[PDB]
Design a protein around this nucleic acid. Structure first.
Ligand SMILES: *C(=O)c1cnc2ccccc2n1
Ligand SMILES: *C(=O)c1cnc2ccccc2n1
Ligand SMILES: *C(=O)c1cnc2ccccc2n1
Ligand SMILES: *C(=O)c1cnc2ccccc2n1
Ligand code: NI
Lengths: 8, 8
DNA sequence: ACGTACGT
DNA sequence: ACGTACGT
């Protein structure tokens, strides 16, 4: 859920 | 992610 | 419900 | 001259 590299 | 000239 | 982010 | 960055 976090987006820091993928954002899902 | 390393910062030695951009640091991202 | 998954990998992105740069230039001296 | 070099890899760090999280939860909905
Ligand atoms: C977001 O909160 C989150 C948490 N765990 C995960 C596991 C795998 C893919 C995506 C995820 N996203
Ligand atoms: C993004 O691509 C990415 C990959 N690995 C991680 C590990 C821990 C926190 C955030 C991350 N983001
Ligand atoms: C940092 O760890 C890192 C890794 N690879 C990259 C590729 C392109 C731009 C920035 C980057 N940062
Ligand atoms: C910073 O500007 C910079 C430019 N290119 C690089 C290539 C390899 C390692 C570190 C670098 N830092
Ligand atoms: Ni470059």
């Amino acid at each position: 859920x976090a987006x820091v590299x993928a954002x899902v």
